[PDB]
Amino acid sequence: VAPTHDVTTDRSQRLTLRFIPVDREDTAYSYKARFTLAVGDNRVLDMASTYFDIRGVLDRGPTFKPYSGTAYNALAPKGAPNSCEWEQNEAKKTHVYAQAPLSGIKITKEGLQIGTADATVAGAGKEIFADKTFQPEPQVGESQWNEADATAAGGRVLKKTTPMKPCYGSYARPTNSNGGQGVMVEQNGKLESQVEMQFFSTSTNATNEVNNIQPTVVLYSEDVNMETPDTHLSYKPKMGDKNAKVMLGQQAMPNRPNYIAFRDNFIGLMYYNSTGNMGVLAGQASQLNAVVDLQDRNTELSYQLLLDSIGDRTRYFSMWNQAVDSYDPDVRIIENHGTEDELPNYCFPLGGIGITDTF
């Protein structure tokens, strides 16, 4: 049975008290503050249950970067660059490298015709074409491996104006509402989406044959902003800019992780052991300081050891960011057993048969 009585009062009394800093000043490197606490009549208090509450703003600099690896086209091989084109003399001609993923139906005088509308009363399904904005996407393609190699198909690469970058670790901010990257230039307003359609036919049939040249490929040239905020080039062919044929081989690797933060136990957040900004606690009756300290009372390390000494340490506590510095032991000392290099592995063709031979 619990104790009967004479433990708790019955006149009203707060269970928690909050106090405002009467005095606050700030300098170049530090700021000082001072409060007037009051322990009231017939009220008694233990100091251990007092702390400070601090709120504010911070920026961890630009270099902060928690994750390793990178998150912009990670799976792609480190070599292959994006579709592009560039200039080259024999007094100046264009060379183009590109891949067109989607097969349509039939080309037109202005733009590839994807599907047809629904025929109606005198409404026989007007030939519905693409939509520069984005109609051609960057992921569609023939579903299965037995592709029929349709006679028409498109893709897209941007102008030679934008500098060339490797596909791995490449990002561009959307500008079109419905997911289409492209620089919107001003023309009495942002209305202009300067996209230029280009047509392409087989080289030999474009040289000379029994017919007028016949395009089978449609390309959409456009322009976007580019950046690789998490990766840097690893090998540079030349030391110059202005993308050329060689620079098609440029490759990059991600930047190292960065893990800045608040050191344990907010160590250093408050001054101690330094006769410069010596803290004060006293009775308001007179200016008579109680807290006197020296230059050598290394309270930090002592308090750390003591906090260890009274219980377990492994568990972390989020009340005051209580968590010790850790490191895997294998990193410091390796145990190189080797590996298990038994029956090897293989990769195979997507259809499962390399090449048959009509018989």
Name the residues that contact its own copies, by CB under 8 A. 66-71, 74, 76-81, 144-145, 253-254, 257, 336-342, 344, 347-353
325 vs 357, which CB is nearer to other proteins?
325
Q: Alpha-carbon distance 132 to 220, whole Å?
A: 7
Name the β-bridge partners of 176: 180
175 vs 194, which CB is nearer to other proteins?
175
- The 3-state DSSP class for residue 284 equals coil
Shortest CB 90 distance to its own copies, Å: 18
134 vs 168, which CB is nearer to its own copies?
168
Q: Alpha-carbon distance 305 to 266, whole Å?
A: 15
Which of other proteins, its own copies, none lies near 58, with the C-beta cut-off 5 to 8 A by kind? other proteins
Shortest CB 232 distance to other proteins, Å: 7
Shortest CB 211 distance to other proteins, Å: 10
240 vs 344, which CB is nearer to its own copies?
344
Which of its own copies, other proteins, none lies near 221, with the C-beta cut-off 5 to 8 A by kind? none
Q: Residue 105 is encoded by which pair of tokens?
A: 């139906």
Which of its own copies, other proteins, none lies near 120, with the C-beta cut-off 5 to 8 A by kind? none
Name the β-bridge partners of 218: 154, 199
27 vs 188, which CB is nearer to other proteins?
27
Amino acid sitting at position 338:
G
Which of its own copies, other proteins, none lies near 353, with the C-beta cut-off 5 to 8 A by kind? its own copies
Q: Residue 68 is encoded by which pair of tokens?
A: 């390793």
Shortest CB 357 distance to other proteins, Å: 18
Q: Residue 281 is encoded by which pair of tokens?
A: 């606690």
Q: Residue 114 is encoded by which pair of tokens?
A: 């994807």
Q: Looking up tokens 């970058």, which residue turns up?
A: 165
The closest alpha carbon to 231, from 78, 15, 18, 44, belongs to: 78
Which of other proteins, its own copies, none lies near 114, with the C-beta cut-off 5 to 8 A by kind? none
Q: Residue 51 is encoded by which pair of tokens?
A: 């702390």
Q: Alpha-carbon distance 237 to 5, whole Å?
A: 87
For 256, counting Cβ atoms within 10 Å of its Cβ (0-12 exposed, 13-18 middle, 19+ buried), the class is: exposed
Shortest CB 257 distance to its own copies, Å: 7
42 vs 68, which CB is nearer to its own copies?
68
Q: What is the DSSP letter of 185?
A: B
Transcribe 143-154 into DSSP letters.
Answer: SSSS----S-EE
CB 197 within 8 A of CB 110: yes
Shortest CB 25 distance to other proteins, Å: 9
139 vs 339, which CB is nearer to its own copies?
339
Shortest CB 330 distance to other proteins, Å: 8
Which of its own copies, other proteins, none lies near 89, with the C-beta cut-off 5 to 8 A by kind? none
Q: Looking up tokens 């044929």, which residue turns up?
A: 245
Q: What is the DSSP letter of 81?
A: B
CB 124 within 8 A of CB 280: no
Shortest CB 241 distance to other proteins, Å: 11
121 vs 343, which CB is nearer to other proteins?
343
Which of its own copies, other proteins, none lies near 194, with the C-beta cut-off 5 to 8 A by kind? none
Which of its own copies, other proteins, none lies near 191, with the C-beta cut-off 5 to 8 A by kind? none
